[PDB]
C-alpha cells in the first residue's frame, strides 16, 4: 500500500 | 467485523464550520486509506477526497480544495473531515469508507449536514444513460455505465466498480475491478465491459434489488461517480 496515493 | 462510527447529525449556520468524525475499529486503521463521499439531494454520490491514516498524506477532489480539510488520530483511530465557509449547497450526508486495495468495501453510516436559510475540465466523467429502470419481479436487466477516458491499468485490471444504495442504507459495494463479484453478491450479478462501455446485468430481478446502482471509477485522482440509476420493480 502506497503511503502518499490511493490510486493503483 | 469492521466498524466505522460516524459523528451524528449538525444543523448549522451558513459561513460557520463542521468538523465530523469517523472511527475505526476492526482493522489496523495506520494501514488503509481512508476516502469521505458526499450525498447531496438531486446529486448522486461525489468524492471529496482520502488520508492515510499512517503517513497523515491526503490528496483532494479539486472541487473541494479549501472546503474540505481531512486529518486522522492514531491514538484514538478516528479520521476527521472539517468543511469551512457553510452554504446551502455543503447540504448533504457525508461517508467515510476504508479503501481495501482500491474496493471501497466499508462505509460508515453518514454524518448529515444541513446548512440554514473553470476547474475540474480533466476529471474522468462517468455516465450512466438511464436515470431510472422499472422490472417486472423475476425479468433481467441491464445497467450501462460509460466513461470519457479508458479505466484500463498498464497492470491489466479495469478499475471500475458498481454500488448499490439501497433506500435508508450506505453504498455497498457490488462488483469491483469491472467483473468481480463482492462477497455475499449472488450469481444473479455480473459486469462486464468493452472499451469505456460497461454493463451491469441482473439475471432475475429481486425486491432485495431496489436501490440505486452507482459506477465509479478508482483508476485515477479525483475519484468520479456515474449519476445513478434507480431500479424500481414494475407492477
Known amino acids: 500500500i502506497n503511503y502518499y496515493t490511493s490510486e493503483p | 467485523e469492521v466498524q466505522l462510527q460516524q459523528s451524528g447529525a449538525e444543523l448549522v449556520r451558513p459561513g460557520t464550520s463542521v468538523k465530523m468524525s469517523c472511527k475505526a475499529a476492526?482493522?489496523?486503521?495506520?494501514?488503509?486509506?481512508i476516502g469521505w463521499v458526499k450525498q447531496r439531494p438531486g446529486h448522486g454520490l461525489e468524492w471529496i477526497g482520502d488520508i492515510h491514516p499512517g503517513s497523515f498524506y491526503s490528496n483532494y477532489n479539486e472541487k473541494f480544495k479549501g472546503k474540505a480539510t481531512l486529518t486522522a488520530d492514531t491514538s484514538s483511530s478516528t479520521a476527521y473531515m472539517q468543511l469551512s465557509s457553510l452554504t446551502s449547497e455543503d447540504s448533504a450526508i457525508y461517508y467515510c469508507?476504508?479503501?481495501?486495495?482500491?474496493?471501497?468495501?466499508?462505509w460508515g453510516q453518514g454524518t448529515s449536514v444541513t446548512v440554514s436559510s473553470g476547474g475540474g475540465g480533466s476529471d474522468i466523467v462517468m455516465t450512466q444513460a438511464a436515470p431510472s429502470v422499472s422490472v417486472t419481479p423475476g425479468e433481467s436487466v441491464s445497467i450501462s455505465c460509460r466513461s470519457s477516458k479508458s479505466l484500463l491499468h498498464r497492470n491489466g485490471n479495469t478499475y471500475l466498480f458498481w454500488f448499490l444504495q439501497r433506500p435508508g442504507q450506505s453504498p455497498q459495494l457490488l462488483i469491483y475491478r469491472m467483473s468481480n463479484l463482492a462477497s455475499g453478491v449472488p450469481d444473479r450479478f455480473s459486469g462486464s465491459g468493452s472499451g469505456t462501455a460497461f454493463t451491469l446485468r441482473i439475471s432475475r430481478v429481486e425486491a432485495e434489488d431496489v436501490g440505486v446502482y452507482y459506477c465509479m471509477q478508482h483508476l485515477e485522482y479525483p475519484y468520479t461517480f456515474g449519476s445513478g440509476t434507480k431500479l424500481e420493480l414494475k407492477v
Open positions: 469508507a476504508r479503501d481495501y486495495y482500491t474496493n471501497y468495501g466499508d
Open positions: 476492526g482493522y489496523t486503521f495506520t494501514k488503509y486509506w
